[PDB]
């Protein structure tokens, strides 16, 4: 189905305390496969997934020099924004950069991304037509003209439309089914009596990849939201994910409640009904 390659850049300026720190992290879908950390000794690009290890020494040297260049690029970018906003040496500011390409089952690009954020707020981002920019305030409008000043989104669209999708394709066919195939959730329902009056049912989904899941509780086959307590999807640590949904139910009416699991790795959506 749909696949995506994304790079996440975080640059944070440290006043007095050394010079800003740079972190890179690379994702195919939501498997991390590379990283870079400027705070390290011998700061290299490092492999974070087994199917990228086969890349030649020139892959790793080349990317290390990219991140080294990228770090220095963001240092002076941090200064320019300080000036746009008239901020002080008293201030630890942050530059966040994210780019990547989303491909369908085609091999064709569906949405490319190139967005930045200053100090948590959105600064500038590239419009889906990959020719335009959208600036959040008057500061980003100087960047927006800086970035029609050297005719830039041309080189940025060319990466997003061009080599970004091919790099995704190369990493997909090298990671084989362990990265292209979706791993389905192992689902079960647990029952905890909370009192004489009541009890909880918890719908567990575990072991799934990718992380996009939907868990719903129903009663008498119709929807029920005002007792649901969902948890945010959490990493298991072994490249799979976890989630649960819970409902408090009158003791004796448990069998009237069905949990409903949607996940791409499932052939058809699941429904689970706790049986005494």
């Amino acid at each position: 189905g749909s696949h995506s390659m994304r790079y996440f850049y975080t640059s944070v300026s440290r006043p007095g305390r050394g010079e800003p720190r740079f972190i890179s992290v690379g994702y195919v879908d939501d498997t991390q496969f590379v990283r870079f950390d400027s705070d390290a000794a011998s700061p290299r690009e490092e492999p974070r997934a087994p199917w990228i290890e086969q890349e030649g020494p020139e892959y790793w040297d080349r990317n290390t020099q990219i991140y080294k260049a990228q770090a220095q690029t963001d240092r002076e970018s941090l200064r320019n924004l300080r000036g746009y906003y008239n901020q002080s040496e008293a201030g630890s500011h942050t530059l966040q950069s994210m780019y990547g390409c989303d491909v369908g089952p085609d091999g064709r690009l569906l949405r490319g991304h190139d967005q930045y954020a200053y100090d948590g707020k959105d600064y500038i981002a590239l419009n889906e037509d990959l020719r335009s920019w959208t600036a959040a305030d008057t500061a980003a409008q100087i960047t927006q003209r800086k970035w029609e000043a050297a005719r830039e989104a041309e080189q940025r669209r060319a990466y997003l439309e061009g080599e970004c999708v091919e790099w995704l394709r190369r990493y997909l066919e090298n990671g084989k089914d362990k990265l292209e195939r979706a791993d389905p959730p192992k689902t079960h329902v647990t029952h905890h009596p909370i009192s004489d009056h009541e009890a909880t049912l918890r719908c567990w989904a575990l072991g799934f990849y990718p992380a996009e899941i939907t868990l719903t509780w129903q009663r008498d086959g119709e929807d029920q939201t005002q007792d649901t307590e969902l948890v945010e999807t959490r990493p298991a640590g072994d490249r799979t994910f976890q989630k649960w949904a819970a409902v408090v139910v009158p003791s004796g009416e448990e069998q009237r409640y069905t949990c409903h699991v949607q996940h791409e790795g499932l052939p058809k959506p699941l429904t689970l009904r706790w049986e005494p």
Binding site: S24, R62, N63, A69, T73, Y159, W167
Partner: peptide, 9 residues
């Protein structure tokens, strides 16, 4: 692999 063309903000 990461992009290689740089600009300043």
């Amino acid at each position: 692999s990461p992009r290689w063309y740089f600009y300043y903000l």
